[PDB]
């Protein structure tokens, strides 16, 4: 568990995207995880592993409503700091028959962090984006298809992110 995972599950989303200022928006719509938005800050990204392996459905309450019902889920929760500073916090619920063919590799990902870089084989594409926020923090919750596959992909933005 972590303090910032326990925010991330705390986000109260709304069906419609808020009217924010553009560049807000810029970021939150952002079509990508955001390793290589950060490193483009001029920083090095790196990951802290807070918990990664495979749970039944009472671990996701919050993602099973978007994703189809299985005997089991691969679960990843990190923090991702730049420079060694925490920026965001994420959560991915992946259903095991989304595990097959390339992207079995979801499961070995360990501390590399996610992005577009690392799938340039499969076709990605995402049906759901919500905004979300608590107390003064943004976050953002999406479902992706690799292959038509889906996924669920959560992330908390930290205050000492460039969004603030």
Not at 10 to 35: G, H
């Amino acid at each position: 568990s972590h303090p910032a995972l326990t925010q991330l599950r705390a986000l109260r989303y709304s069906k419609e995207i808020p009217a924010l200022d553009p560049q807000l928006l810029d970021w939150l719509l952002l079509e990508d995880s955001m390793t290589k938005r950060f490193e483009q800050q001029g920083k090095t990204v790196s990951v802290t592993m807070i918990r990664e392996g495979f749970v039944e459905q009472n671990e996701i309450p919050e993602e099973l409503p978007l994703l189809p019902k299985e005997s089991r889920y691969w679960l990843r929760e990190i923090l991702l700091s730049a420079d060694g500073e925490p920026w965001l916090a994420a959560r991915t619920v992946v259903p095991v028959s989304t595990l097959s063919g390339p992207e079995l590799a979801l499961q070995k990902l360990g501390k590399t962090p996610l992005g577009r870089y690392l799938f340039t084989s499969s076709t990605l594409t995402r049906d759901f984006i919500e905004i979300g926020r608590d107390a003064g923090l943004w976050g953002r919750r999406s479902r992706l298809r690799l292959s038509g596959k889906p996924l669920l992909l959560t992330e908390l933005f930290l205050p000492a992110s460039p969004l603030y």
